[PDB]
């Protein structure tokens, strides 16, 4: 029916930064060779989407953001093998071409075909598949999930369990997988250890989930929003700290609390200052600190190199270290097998048209994850 | 004979920074319980000793510097069970009390009894065993090897093979073990990988030895002093680069010649800029950079945290990551079994009286490691 035809549908377009998303009627071109058109079912609102609006994260505008979602394959372009119409799929913002040096490496997951380092806002052939009022609109991370339909590259999609709850498993497109793997895969949190997690939003709580599943003996959640505490305890935190309650720095407090420093700390906010503090918090001779938060564009932090010379380790990771195509489908199965829970991350469900309301809840600090249903 | 009595001997005293060492007569008190008095046989000139002179490295003055050496036990205090008079020993600038958290940790080596973080320049009891011109002189890292005799705590001394050439194994006291351990133990260089080593002095060449030992396929030596290249090629470097020969920044040059970045890079100079540069030139998704050089006191570096977010790992280490008391004797044995060569690092051998000429050879870039003999 729609196959081979330009679809006219609704999409939330961001024309200028610091503006609300305007639901517009856009024309989604049919998938070219090796591309896949997807009908969106559920998409989550991640902080990185808000960074685009805030101007924190620079990307070509106008653009259709959205990168955490799950849908159904409508049509596939010429050459597509991995999926076919009717398939349930999760678009992957970190592709997996399986051909570059990174994809061929045992532990790298930052595929060279990504559109993150230097965003272009186009398809692999450098063109867009979205038009609004005769004006081409940019893609976002090769995903652009804030649209009833979207076109992604074959390398940027994973087929998932046909029986999976699309309205929940969408969290596996970013938030969950990022948090879980940051603790489990990047930091490789050990049993009995003490962990510190700065930022208790969807991604942070998923970090706590990873730490808890890794058998962490102590998991101290850190946030300036106390209303996050109860939910944090719920998913694993053993204690929660609000930096506003003290007269001394949180690094001093956390070091005193942990008797010399934590074993693993995670920065899940996106602030330069909290990135340094998370480093300082870990034990000087063997602590490990992982940056999960996305920093403001072009900002450089300053730190004393002696923090590392004593023995600390500092690393970062996109998508929790998971090779997208390989991991997403297996992560979904683990969900179907009740190996972990996504339910505590979802605080609100709203229809797609109410996206702006969904971003205000996040900015207000009233929600963890809001899922948008089409 | 001299046991239980003060000893009058010569030692190189640094009264004020940026001044030459004064070879003078000092009185070395007898060892107290759990202390050991050593007759120095050989001591190498490490750049960290030069940092004390320059004021780059802050420690209480006046002081008797020196930390890379080998000697013989003259007498032991009460309770000393690990060594005995006549034993060949290597003083350890990084101790191993074996009781603290770090000591108990399987990975940590930065013993909490160290005198590196908050240098107070005394013995573990708060006192000094040195007197010069009637005044008490400070110890340095609990070692102070630029003296014919010295007293160190038992947790700061390791008994070595009685047949070892002290004029050589002294390098295991710092330069060699640090360079070699950084590659082998800290970075954990993989077989077939590409490494870049910044700084080709005594410790840097030891990193090259460790990289070659771990099985690195390509080891690029980076130094502004082309006179070091030959010796570097001699110990393992496959190519040597001099930033001066290029019209383009070194990180681009290295990235281009490595086809997107090295797997492992090491900063073995002690500069804020080369530390960030070394980080930059390692592959963004899986590269690891190890800081080995000592930075100037109280100086912060500036960097973009996005360098870490893509997946890079940054770490630093003291004494090559080795738990000191456990490792040094094994390192000496391996040397005895011809597992590695120290000869290539020794360019000059001078008697203790020519310490100042020794520091000039280093500053001039004329020597790699100069060993002073007593
Ligand atoms: N590395 C990746 O692949 C990846 C993936 C997903 C999200 N992110 C980034 O992770 C960060 C968090 O995303 P989220 O979706 O969980 O966000 P969120 O907005 O739900 O949560 C951020 C949390 O940090 C707290 N916070 C803010 N400032 C704080 C401070 N100064 N001190 C202590 N706590 C503070 C907030 O109250 C909030 O609870 C964002 O920067 C996002 O862009 C990165
Ligand atoms: N972490 C530890 O445990 C430990 C142990 C020993 C030494 N160190 C430190 O390691 C560093 C090296 O010590 P070393 O004894 O081998 O010193 P070294 O003086 O022999 O110096 C190494 C090299 O750095 C080179 N260099 C200087 N500036 C350069 C630049 N801008 N670019 C490229 N090359 C440059 C010099 O030409 C020299 O060849 C020092 O900072 C020292 O204090 C640390
Ligand atoms: O070379 C080892 C070394 C020293 F001696 C110091 F004094 C110091 F502070 C360091 F950090 C070192 F690595
Ligand atoms: O949430 C993941 C994420 C994004 F969407 C971005 F746009 C980005 F640049 C990141 F670095 C992210 F981690
Ligand atoms: Zn996200
Ligand atoms: Zn790839
Ligand atoms: Zn040294
Ligand atoms: Zn100890």
mmCIF file with all atom_site columns, N, CA and C and ligand atoms in Angstrom, chain B residues 44-49 67-68 93 140-141 173-175 178 203 294 369, ligand 7:
data_model
loop_
_atom_site.group_PDB
_atom_site.id
_atom_site.type_symbol
_atom_site.label_atom_id
_atom_site.label_alt_id
_atom_site.label_comp_id
_atom_site.label_asym_id
_atom_site.label_entity_id
_atom_site.label_seq_id
_atom_site.pdbx_PDB_ins_code
_atom_site.Cartn_x
_atom_site.Cartn_y
_atom_site.Cartn_z
_atom_site.occupancy
_atom_site.B_iso_or_equiv
_atom_site.pdbx_formal_charge
_atom_site.auth_seq_id
_atom_site.auth_comp_id
_atom_site.auth_asym_id
_atom_site.auth_atom_id
_atom_site.pdbx_PDB_model_num
ATOM   1  N  N   . UNK B 1 44  ? 71.132 5.447  40.798 1.00 0.00 ? 44  UNK B N   1
ATOM   2  C  CA  . UNK B 1 44  ? 70.975 6.060  39.491 1.00 0.00 ? 44  UNK B CA  1
ATOM   3  C  C   . UNK B 1 44  ? 70.370 7.443  39.574 1.00 0.00 ? 44  UNK B C   1
ATOM   4  N  N   . UNK B 1 45  ? 70.623 8.262  38.557 1.00 0.00 ? 45  UNK B N   1
ATOM   5  C  CA  . UNK B 1 45  ? 70.051 9.598  38.506 1.00 0.00 ? 45  UNK B CA  1
ATOM   6  C  C   . UNK B 1 45  ? 68.732 9.598  37.698 1.00 0.00 ? 45  UNK B C   1
ATOM   7  N  N   . UNK B 1 46  ? 67.609 9.599  38.421 1.00 0.00 ? 46  UNK B N   1
ATOM   8  C  CA  . UNK B 1 46  ? 66.280 9.626  37.804 1.00 0.00 ? 46  UNK B CA  1
ATOM   9  C  C   . UNK B 1 46  ? 65.786 11.075 37.651 1.00 0.00 ? 46  UNK B C   1
ATOM   10 N  N   . UNK B 1 47  ? 64.977 11.328 36.628 1.00 0.00 ? 47  UNK B N   1
ATOM   11 C  CA  . UNK B 1 47  ? 64.466 12.674 36.422 1.00 0.00 ? 47  UNK B CA  1
ATOM   12 C  C   . UNK B 1 47  ? 63.672 13.208 37.619 1.00 0.00 ? 47  UNK B C   1
ATOM   13 N  N   . UNK B 1 48  ? 63.065 12.326 38.425 1.00 0.00 ? 48  UNK B N   1
ATOM   14 C  CA  . UNK B 1 48  ? 62.295 12.771 39.599 1.00 0.00 ? 48  UNK B CA  1
ATOM   15 C  C   . UNK B 1 48  ? 63.164 13.437 40.660 1.00 0.00 ? 48  UNK B C   1
ATOM   16 N  N   . UNK B 1 49  ? 64.458 13.110 40.644 1.00 0.00 ? 49  UNK B N   1
ATOM   17 C  CA  . UNK B 1 49  ? 65.431 13.711 41.560 1.00 0.00 ? 49  UNK B CA  1
ATOM   18 C  C   . UNK B 1 49  ? 65.688 15.123 41.034 1.00 0.00 ? 49  UNK B C   1
ATOM   19 N  N   . UNK B 1 67  ? 66.467 7.901  45.115 1.00 0.00 ? 67  UNK B N   1
ATOM   20 C  CA  . UNK B 1 67  ? 65.466 6.869  45.383 1.00 0.00 ? 67  UNK B CA  1
ATOM   21 C  C   . UNK B 1 67  ? 65.655 5.610  44.536 1.00 0.00 ? 67  UNK B C   1
ATOM   22 N  N   . UNK B 1 68  ? 66.535 5.674  43.536 1.00 0.00 ? 68  UNK B N   1
ATOM   23 C  CA  . UNK B 1 68  ? 66.801 4.536  42.645 1.00 0.00 ? 68  UNK B CA  1
ATOM   24 C  C   . UNK B 1 68  ? 68.206 4.041  42.989 1.00 0.00 ? 68  UNK B C   1
ATOM   25 N  N   . UNK B 1 93  ? 60.874 3.179  47.090 1.00 0.00 ? 93  UNK B N   1
ATOM   26 C  CA  . UNK B 1 93  ? 60.239 4.482  47.268 1.00 0.00 ? 93  UNK B CA  1
ATOM   27 C  C   . UNK B 1 93  ? 58.708 4.366  47.426 1.00 0.00 ? 93  UNK B C   1
ATOM   28 N  N   . UNK B 1 140 ? 63.852 11.477 51.779 1.00 0.00 ? 140 UNK B N   1
ATOM   29 C  CA  . UNK B 1 140 ? 63.106 11.695 50.546 1.00 0.00 ? 140 UNK B CA  1
ATOM   30 C  C   . UNK B 1 140 ? 62.468 10.357 50.215 1.00 0.00 ? 140 UNK B C   1
ATOM   31 N  N   . UNK B 1 141 ? 61.134 10.325 50.216 1.00 0.00 ? 141 UNK B N   1
ATOM   32 C  CA  . UNK B 1 141 ? 60.351 9.133  49.908 1.00 0.00 ? 141 UNK B CA  1
ATOM   33 C  C   . UNK B 1 141 ? 60.719 7.932  50.769 1.00 0.00 ? 141 UNK B C   1
ATOM   34 N  N   . UNK B 1 173 ? 65.048 -0.258 40.989 1.00 0.00 ? 173 UNK B N   1
ATOM   35 C  CA  . UNK B 1 173 ? 64.586 0.579  42.078 1.00 0.00 ? 173 UNK B CA  1
ATOM   36 C  C   . UNK B 1 173 ? 63.619 1.651  41.600 1.00 0.00 ? 173 UNK B C   1
ATOM   37 N  N   . UNK B 1 174 ? 63.616 1.924  40.300 1.00 0.00 ? 174 UNK B N   1
ATOM   38 C  CA  . UNK B 1 174 ? 62.687 2.900  39.741 1.00 0.00 ? 174 UNK B CA  1
ATOM   39 C  C   . UNK B 1 174 ? 62.527 2.897  38.221 1.00 0.00 ? 174 UNK B C   1
ATOM   40 N  N   . UNK B 1 175 ? 63.518 3.423  37.515 1.00 0.00 ? 175 UNK B N   1
ATOM   41 C  CA  . UNK B 1 175 ? 63.457 3.541  36.066 1.00 0.00 ? 175 UNK B CA  1
ATOM   42 C  C   . UNK B 1 175 ? 62.956 2.340  35.288 1.00 0.00 ? 175 UNK B C   1
ATOM   43 N  N   . UNK B 1 178 ? 59.325 0.855  36.519 1.00 0.00 ? 178 UNK B N   1
ATOM   44 C  CA  . UNK B 1 178 ? 58.255 1.803  36.173 1.00 0.00 ? 178 UNK B CA  1
ATOM   45 C  C   . UNK B 1 178 ? 57.935 1.735  34.676 1.00 0.00 ? 178 UNK B C   1
ATOM   46 N  N   . UNK B 1 203 ? 63.214 5.844  31.639 1.00 0.00 ? 203 UNK B N   1
ATOM   47 C  CA  . UNK B 1 203 ? 61.918 5.208  31.880 1.00 0.00 ? 203 UNK B CA  1
ATOM   48 C  C   . UNK B 1 203 ? 61.161 4.931  30.564 1.00 0.00 ? 203 UNK B C   1
ATOM   49 N  N   . UNK B 1 294 ? 55.849 12.719 35.809 1.00 0.00 ? 294 UNK B N   1
ATOM   50 C  CA  . UNK B 1 294 ? 55.368 13.472 36.974 1.00 0.00 ? 294 UNK B CA  1
ATOM   51 C  C   . UNK B 1 294 ? 55.138 14.927 36.547 1.00 0.00 ? 294 UNK B C   1
ATOM   52 N  N   . UNK B 1 369 ? 70.652 6.913  31.480 1.00 0.00 ? 369 UNK B N   1
ATOM   53 C  CA  . UNK B 1 369 ? 70.810 6.731  32.927 1.00 0.00 ? 369 UNK B CA  1
ATOM   54 C  C   . UNK B 1 369 ? 72.271 6.774  33.341 1.00 0.00 ? 369 UNK B C   1
HETATM 55 ZN ZN1 . LIG C 2 .   ? 62.475 7.761  39.584 1.00 0.00 ? 7   LIG C ZN1 1
#
